[PDB]
């Protein structure tokens, strides 16, 4: 699909980038390392993580375990073996696959043959250690940052707020946030181009190996094919490759200059979304950027002039007599009418124009940046709210100055702080993305099925796990989403009926909440209620238009002889609190570390 000219251009870009960085490539790993053993220990640990839970194991699994054990026994020898393989082995055992069934979207599961898997692991770990050590991946890349997805989201929000005079709508200042997915970003990486790219960043042998690993025979259920074109996500290291490829895309988007700014100078790089000066920050439209895992998040802060230019070029390019293009717009359907992005002929045009520009910026043969898989939010005079999704959140950022009346900041709202003044300059209301809700629902469904054999305790345990995942991941943001609440009640009742069905009872009187919510210590089940919550059920026809104050409470998971079962949500520290708190405690730690230094003691 790639035009050779395009490939050449890409090469030029990447070369230019590393040139600017003084990025010394990763060597082929010799016997030199003090870390070698340590590195090995990580990979093994990771691999072990699969096997610690499931006691009954397959033949392949058993083999893998054995290999791991031997590796522990003979570390140096194992390392040597790995090295030899890397030097030599460019044809591997074929990769079996299956589909894990998330009932929306079935996900492919690649299963590499254990011997190569160790190699993949070690190589991967080494690459990450070397890359991060050498500052390959610039701050702006999200998923790998050593910060939690909700944390990441929070940081993003903070960055947005802390932009210099970002919320002004006075001098025709117009912000636009561009969410889009790099469609099939891995699934159309050509090995030739990929190989050459890697040969920039690492010792060519490693590159050769990696390219040869993606080129495997993909057996599935009696049908095979040589995976001639398209990276396989399910190798261990493949993530690194994807990330590296992502860098290319990022560079294409931002160009050498803006990217250079975001990274900072090579010797002393920027922190996540900091800038060496204000001037530099203000210079470009593209004030912030982050590619969380094949989903870029370009934030533009246009002026009236610039915006006018953009609309002009686009509109002239792609005309329309009426408003017209307001339909076929990717709005945030979870939010309410006057909450989500209003459809102004101007602002919408700008948004669409912006998207067009971005599309033009990336070559089509490399990846699919289809409008359909792209949400563009806009902030302006006529658009006060500013929306996006990230890490499966939906976040409506609304600045304090634009709010008509700042009520008692509710729950599931992050008050963002301006770094200069230290005032609560903007709010960020939080919903859970529909997609995440769907995923959760699918999880529940999965739990439910394949439970005719399974015993009540195990079922409840699984459900407990599911619930704790759902909350502990996005805690605060559950308050808002009524659909999620519904799912929780519905799901929880379904689980209860799994027990109650199991006893062929399925009846209210004879399963008082004793049996369910009492822990496993007392003959209970240990079910964790996210149920006996009162579901906030406001006026459905009005609520669609604007956010209401919650007026009417529906009864969620009810019961006769209603003992007020506490929820789980009250016993998890909501994220904003966790993050302010984090800032405090880490500050304290820092201060005490300084004290220790001064005093010359072990803190």
């Amino acid at each position: 699909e790639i035009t050779p000219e395009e490939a050449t251009t890409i090469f030029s870009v990447m070369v230019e980038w590393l040139e600017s960085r003084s990025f010394s490539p990763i060597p082929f790993p010799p016997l030199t390392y003090k870390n070698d053993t340590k590195i090995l220990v990580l990979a093994l640990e990771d691999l072990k993580d699969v096997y610690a839970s499931k006691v009954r194991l397959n033949a392949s699994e058993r083999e893998e375990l054995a290999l791991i054990e031997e590796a522990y026994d003979n570390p140096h020898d194992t390392l040597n073996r790995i090295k030899k393989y890397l030097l030599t082995q460019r044809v591997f055992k074929p990769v079996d696959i299956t589909m894990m069934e998330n009932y929306q979207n079935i996900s492919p599961v690649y299963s590499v043959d254990p011997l190569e898997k160790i190699t993949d692991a070690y190589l991967d770990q080494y690459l990450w250690y070397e890359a991060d050590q050498r500052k390959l991946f610039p701050n702006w890349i999200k998923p790998s940052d050593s910060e939690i997805p909700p944390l990441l989201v929070y940081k993003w929000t903070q960055g947005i707020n802390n932009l210099s005079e970002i919320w002004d709508v006075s001098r025709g200042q117009s912000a636009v946030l561009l969410e889009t997915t790099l469609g099939e970003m891995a699934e159309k990486i050509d090995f030739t181009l990929l190989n050459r790219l890697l040969r920039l960043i690492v010792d060519p042998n490693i590159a050769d190996y990696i390219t040869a690993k993606n080129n495997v025979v993909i057996n599935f259920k009696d049908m095979s094919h040589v995976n001639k074109y398209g990276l396989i996500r399910g190798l261990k290291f493949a993530s690194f490759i994807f990330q590296y490829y992502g860098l290319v895309i990022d560079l294409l988007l931002l160009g050498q200059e803006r990217a250079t700014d975001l990274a900072g100078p090579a010797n002393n790089p920027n922190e996540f979304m900091q800038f060496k000066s204000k001037e530099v920050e203000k210079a470009h439209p593209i004030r912030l950027y982050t590619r969380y895992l094949d989903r870029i998040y370009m934030l533009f802060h246009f002026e009236e002039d610039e915006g006018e230019e953009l609309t002009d070029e686009y509109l002239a390019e792609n005309p329309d007599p009426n408003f017209e293009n307001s339909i076929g717009y990717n709005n945030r359907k979870c939010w309410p009418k006057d909450s989500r992005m209003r459809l102004i002929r101007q602002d919408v045009n700008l948004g669409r124009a912006v998207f067009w520009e971005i599309q033009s910026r990336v070559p089509t043969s490399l990846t699919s940046i289809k409008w359909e898989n792209a949400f563009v939010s806009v902030y302006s005079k006529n658009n006060p709210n500013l929306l996006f999704s990230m890490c499966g959140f939906e976040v409506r950022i609304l600045p304090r100055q634009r709010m008509e009346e700042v009520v008692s900041n509710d729950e599931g709202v992050w008050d963002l702080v301006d770094e200069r003044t230290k005032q609560r300059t903007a709010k960020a209301y939080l919903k859970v993305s529909e997609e995440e809700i769907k995923k959760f629902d699918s999880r529940i469904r999965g739990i439910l099925m394949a439970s005719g054999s399974t015993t009540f305790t195990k079922v409840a345990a699984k459900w407990n796990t599911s619930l704790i995942s759902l909350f502990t991941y996005f805690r605060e943001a559950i308050v808002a989403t009524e659909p999620l609440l519904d799912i929780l009640v519905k799901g929880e009742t379904r689980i209860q009926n799994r027990v109650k069905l199991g006893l062929n009872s399925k009846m209210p009187t004879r399963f008082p909440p004793a049996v369910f919510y009492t822990p496993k210590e007392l003959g209970g089940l240990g079910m964790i209620s996210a149920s006996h919550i009162l579901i906030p059920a406001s006026d459905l026809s009005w609520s669609k238009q604007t956010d209401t104050g919650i007026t009417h409470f529906r009864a969620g998971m009810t019961h006769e002889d209603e003992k007020l079962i506490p929820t789980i949500f009250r016993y998890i520290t909501t994220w904003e609190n966790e993050f302010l708190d984090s800032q405090r405690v880490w500050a304290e730690y820092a201060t005490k570390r300084q004290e220790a230094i001064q005093q010359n003691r072990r803190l």
Partner: peptide, 30 residues
């Protein structure tokens, strides 16, 4: 000025090859 500095500045009767079908597969795999 800022838009210059990029790298790129300016039916079939086969159920296995239908636009709907490929799209569907794209949707329901990841």
């Amino acid at each position: 000025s800022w838009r210059k500095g990029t790298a790129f500045g300016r039916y079939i009767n086969d159920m296995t090859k239908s636009e709907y079908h490929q799209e569907f597969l794209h949707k329901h795999v990841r």
